[PDB]
Design a protein around this ligand. Structure first.
Ligand SMILES: [Cl-]
Ligand SMILES: [Cl-]
Lengths: 784, 784
């Protein structure tokens, strides 16, 4: 397991040591998660979510689950190879046959995913990639006779379409399209859904550049009694060229080749959805050639490059370097650039994902604030979701009243303003969700902060309704009286940040109003939530305070601690209680758990969070997004070593036991690693394998502004590093407001205070304030 | 393939010749479809539908689809057998290993399902059955060393639980319960669903009578790299006794036995859902013993016996005899006794399924009329569904306005009144769905018939809204103007039957009102629907008449023909046009198609029916329920040979090509055999394998009253047979109004008219009118 191609890829060389590991790709309209053994999950937008490769049964509407189980007929991307001289077979990448291989590489790439495998002296290369703007998978297969004698082979792509629909499904070979076309009608019953579903891409295509010897479109006939392990159609000399008539369809082709010693051949295919044959052919003409593949690859590299971000690092930790330089920025960029491929992002996701873009393409951030605030309610309250398309609707959790949505506005805007200095966004005029009222961004923000001050009970604590940041914490306040400890403390943080902005803008009454606000809230928190060694989590509708030392499950939550540090409820006296409480009850080798001990049964004044399996998701996992709010809190009070230790725990490896236990390639941060570390040690640390998470925008922020300490201010670039003490030297390159800063950090026993040199001469203070677009500056930072 | 055990069972001796074939069982709260290879689909009521054995992914809410595809990890019921001396393995019944077997029997039973298999000299017996009233599967395994030497075996039940839930799933071995308990929390998000789901049976148990050597509850660890074909846990000496912690759970046990020459051992298990361990143990104590199995089997036999029905036959066709005597009555009884295990049966299903019970347990019929009519709307209109439980709701198609619901009332009541003579039901007082109005059944019926007369347009034709009997015919009248040809003619039938009842009850104005009604409708049909050689199907919202000779797809529908014969729109002149049109365009070797040619693309003034795959379900399949309305129509005009031919086509076999093509065991009539006979001959005749269908109550009625001609009247039993001419003799035994009639039929060239003898002396007329409860009468019926 290691980086290759100068960081462009990361290679895993066993199909069994880490069998859940995967990587992803995306583009403007789709995403695909590819498992190391050949399984895959693909979703596209049209404009709502859909799939073209289906399960063999009628599946629920869903993308993936955490810790997704795969199974033999799970959708996947495979090539069977048959020795026509011996009848022996194997499959690439490893499933479905699972033969002994002589060689195996799975390569996660920034811009592609690929495998190299060998068996029976035949060398197989498989490469997947996507164009920027169309929904289609670009597949490249290379087969090489690696021996001294000719070899006769039958080569079979197997791209199973699955059970498409109970109403109508079929498939046939189309000579005109040049491959297989499966077709269905998405089930429905209401006449309105006919009109709504009319432009669905209900065909799935698998198209060949090179005409094959034969094909099979009927899944059962492909398998016969041999099943996937040894399909009958492959035991025969030739595929039988069957179709599917209200039978489960499949995409199987056959090439028969005699290959000379050392001879290699290449075959191209495309796979995806289409409205009709005409669209499949349009895509074929556009992509299915050496030239279409090359042009797509180079447009796609350029897209990834445009999102490369603002920080390259060179530290003594080569695993961190590789992760931060090569993998983190693409994962941030995915979130803000396509908003997790939903037409109704959760508001807090929209805002936090876009916060991350401040460091990548800040104009997308700016647009995101304008778009979100145009959907603010006239009361100042923000909706649970942001609609990205006319006609979309709030779905799933966005229909369940949660109360924290306004908080994110000044919290995330702060990052934007520090990075860009675009205080002028505050003067942009935007409407509200209803009414004829158009007001500046700044007036919107004021009304959001007033909303949060009004949405509090007689004690001055924030109402929780059916949840706050913790989506399934739904029964604390469902009767209309319960309050959140996390929301209270986070509200005080928000109010303090926004009061700073008001002061910076000469809005001095506002600055006072909101600072007073924050003091009131923190007082109420200190009176009603503080539990003696840590802050509690909320007070239920019936007046019980939970997240306290009296509770046997859910005894401490991370979030109220992190956010009391930030918002100022935690003073100098309280902070060391927090740190030790968190370390004793929540820290693990895989990072910090969000609550503990995990709940093992329903507690119905807290609610659905407590019914999740203990140590999964919000029920006490190492939930990385909560972990990173703690990291950030630690950085805000100079707890440099603690912060770095806990941040570095998010990245698996290089320890081999760690790698195997988490079962993840280190090419993304998952939403969680399994918690309940004390209750269930066997599974603890296991990765969810979910690449969708708002964690990464905060991780990137922590590195840039906190660890490396290269943070923007209205004066310029502020140098305030918090490197771990083990590093004798490190470098970073920072792109900032159109300039580049080559930074060298070095520990020196000759000094008492940090000393900063700019282009060799020493500065006073810690701000670089003469910044010209296009220039490069040498910074030397000497540290005690 | 043939009947065994004196008709108690039917045996199939290949696992591959008919791999979709199955049988079912049910009880008061559940049903299970068992496939010949070991796959199964089970549903239970609690009080809504649920499952305990899940797919390996997140499946949609559904029972089964037509022509259900199975796949390797589909839920199933399996036993692996390992030769500990050689490492060789096989599985019962055939999946998952698919080894060569020395012997194979699949036995569909009336009261159980079982297999006998042999391989490696070991003889395996497997038997499934259910008790009458609890949700639990009773499993009995027998293993016999069939050789001369001792043999060492490892024996592994494999009952996979599947992927239960993304929120929470697990499993472990429980010594106290005596087996494996998988556990989950059904996913939800709304607080109201917590309260609604609180008593769900979210545990699945697999409990052993005999303590095993080891177990495995983690599915992945069971399989390892060997997969289902050759699981790793079975290659080992002993199972590793793992659990499942937010991993997909499984039920695997291991018994290790040395068996003497000829020695057999028996192992018992139960499998099912439970709320908690306490319920699993309650079921264990009740059932898991030789004595619990025996008591359950004998209570279950008694339940099936109580539904045996009123007709045993002995004809020259031994396939018909077996089907009618042994299989048909249980399938009728299932429908009315549990109403297809939905809490909101479609109204037309409720009424027609219960009609069938007239011949089985007529008091359930009577209750069904009372229950249905208590939910009639004050306008006289009937709702789309009948609610069988306080709090249930209309679901799926029952939310989409269909208009035919009232029609079934007099159509099906006629059967009830002829069979039982219970005209006194008509005087029972029942409420309506809303209001304080309580009226007699008879007044309700009048208001239903008036409803049907009012629900017609200016031309006097019935509005279709979003459908009639054809559930997905949703776009003929969705704008509020379209009308049905089928509903018009069926309304006239209904009105005529009900006018007869009114006359029989001295309600003479009503009798006139409704007879006039029927004449008006038939006139309008003859003016606007008749198309010259057959009756059209409807007139769209924009005034187009479809189901005509001008249409290239959907050129003729069966239903308007059948029902014009019944209701009298078709006169003596028109009837022979119908017969020839139906025979030329609709008849097939597998029976009569409901429409043709099948639709191959959306036609959006007809609607969703046209998007189903051509020859599946309502889009031109041999849809048996439509076929049987034709059969019944044919009988009502003395077309004896045509009627019998088409009825006999519903029963597959004995022709071998027929059997293999339809792919069904002849132990039930499916809802459809594939149509589009001319467009897609390769698949035509394929069985849906769906045992839920309102067909069978009409088939039973046709046999009893039509073919065998033993029909009730207010005078007694009317002898009016329509035997096919090939039969030289036949017998039937008819139970009727508490008496038995041993009937012998014989063709005699000595007579001009039918002659009937009762206890050897000749009667005049054709009615037996002296009927004493408990008596047996000899009837001899001589025919020309
Ligand atoms: Cl939380
Ligand atoms: Cl119809």
């Amino acid at each position: 397991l290691k980086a290759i191609n100068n960081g462009e890829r990361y290679q895993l060389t066993s199909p069994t040591a880490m069998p859940q590991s995967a990587s992803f790709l995306w583009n403007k309209k789709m995403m695909i998660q590819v498992n190391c053994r050949g399984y895959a999950v693909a979703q596209f937008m049209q404009p709502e979510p859909a799939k073209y490769a289906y399960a063999p049964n009628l599946e629920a509407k869903t993308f993936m689950q955490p810790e997704q189980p795969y199974y033999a007929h799970h959708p996947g991307r495979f090539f069977y190879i048959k020795d026509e001289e011996t009848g022996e077979i194997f499959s690439a990448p490893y499933e479905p046959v699972r033969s002994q291989l002589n060689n195996f590489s799975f390569n996660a790439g920034k811009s592609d995913i690929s495998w190299h495998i060998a068996a029976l002296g035949i060398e197989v290369e498989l490469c997947l990639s996507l164009p920027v703007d169309d929904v289609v998978e670009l597949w490249e297969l290379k087969i090489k006779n690696g021996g001294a004698q000719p070899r006769k082979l039958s080569i079979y792509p197997y791209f199973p379409v699955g059970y498409m629909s109970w109403m109508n499904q079929s498939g046939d070979y189309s000579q005109t399209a040049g491959g297989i076309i499966a077709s269905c009608v998405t089930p429905y019953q209401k006449v309105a859904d006919y009109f709504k579903n009319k432009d669905f891409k209900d065909k799935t295509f698998f198209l060949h550049e090179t005409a094959p010897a034969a094909w099979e479109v009927n899944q059962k006939n492909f398998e016969g009694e041999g099943g996937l392990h040894n399909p009958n159609a492959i035991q025969q000399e030739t595929l039988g060229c069957g179709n599917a008539l209200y039978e489960t369809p499949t995409a199987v082709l056959q090439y028969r080749r005699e290959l000379a010693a050392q001879e290699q051949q290449t075959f191209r295919f495309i796979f995806g959805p289409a409205f009709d044959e005409s669209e499949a052919i349009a895509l074929r003409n556009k992509y299915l050639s050496a030239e279409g593949f090359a042009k797509a690859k180079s447009e796609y590299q350029t897209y990834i490059t445009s999102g490369k971000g603002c920080l390259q690092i060179n530290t003594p930790d080569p695993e961190l370097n590789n992760f931060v330089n090569h993998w983190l920025p693409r994962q941030v960029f995915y979130h803000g650039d396509v908003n997790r491929l939903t037409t109704d992002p959760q508001t807090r996701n929209y805002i936090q994902d876009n916060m991350g873009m401040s460091y990548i393409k800040p104009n997308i951030t700016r647009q995101a604030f304008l778009h979100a605030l145009s959907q603010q309610e006239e009361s100042g309250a923000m909706p649970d979701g942001i609609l990205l398309l006319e006609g979309a609707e709030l779905k799933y959790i966005n229909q369940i009243p949660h109360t924290d949505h306004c908080v994110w506005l000044p919290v995330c805007m702060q990052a934007y303003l520090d990075e860009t200095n675009d205080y002028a966004l505050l003067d942009e005029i935007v409407p509200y969700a209803s009414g004829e009222k158009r007001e500046t961004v700044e007036q919107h923000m004021h009304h959001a902060m007033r909303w949060l001050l009004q949405a509090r009970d007689e004690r001055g604590l924030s109402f929780i309704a059916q949840g706050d940041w913790c989506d399934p914490m739904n029964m604390v306040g469902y009767k209309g009286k319960g309050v959140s400890g996390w929301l209270s403390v986070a509200t005080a943080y928000a109010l303090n940040l926004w009061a700073d902005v008001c002061e910076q803008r000469q809005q001095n009454s506002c600055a006072n109003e909101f600072r007073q606000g924050a003091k009131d809230i923190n007082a109420a928190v200190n009176k009603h939530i503080w539990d003696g060694e840590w802050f509690g989590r909320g007070i239920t509708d019936d007046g019980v305070l939970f997240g306290t030392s009296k509770d046997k499950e859910g005894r401490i939550f991370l979030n109220p601690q992190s956010w009391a540090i930030l918002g100022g409820a935690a003073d100098e006296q309280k902070i060391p209680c927090l740190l030790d409480a968190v370390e004793q009850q929540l820290e693990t080798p895989y990072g910090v758990m969000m609550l503990a001990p995990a709940f093992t049964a329903m507690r119905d004044d807290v609610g659905r969070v407590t019914q999740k399996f203990p140590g999964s998701a919000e029920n006490g996992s190492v939930y990385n997004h909560a972990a990173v709010f703690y990291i950030f809190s630690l950085l805000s009070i100079g707890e440099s070593e603690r912060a770095y230790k806990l941040l570095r725990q998010m990245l698996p490896g290089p320890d081999e036991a760690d790698l195997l236990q988490r079962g993840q390639l280190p090419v993304f941060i998952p939403n969680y690693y399994r918690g309940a570390y004390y209750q269930h040690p066997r599974t603890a640390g296991r990765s969810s394998q979910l690449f969708n998470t708002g964690t990464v925008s905060w991780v990137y922020r922590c590195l840039i502004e906190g660890v490396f300490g290269l943070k923007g201010s209205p004066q310029g670039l502020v140098v305030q590093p918090q490197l771990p003490v083990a590093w004798q030297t490190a470098e970073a390159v920072r792109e900032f407001r159109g300039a580049t800063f080559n930074v060298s950090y070095r520990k020196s026993s000759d000094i008492k205070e940090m000393e900063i040199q700019l282009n060799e001469s020493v500065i006073s203070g810690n701000t670089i304030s003469d910044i010209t677009a296009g220039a490069t500056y040498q910074l030397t930072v000497l540290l005690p």
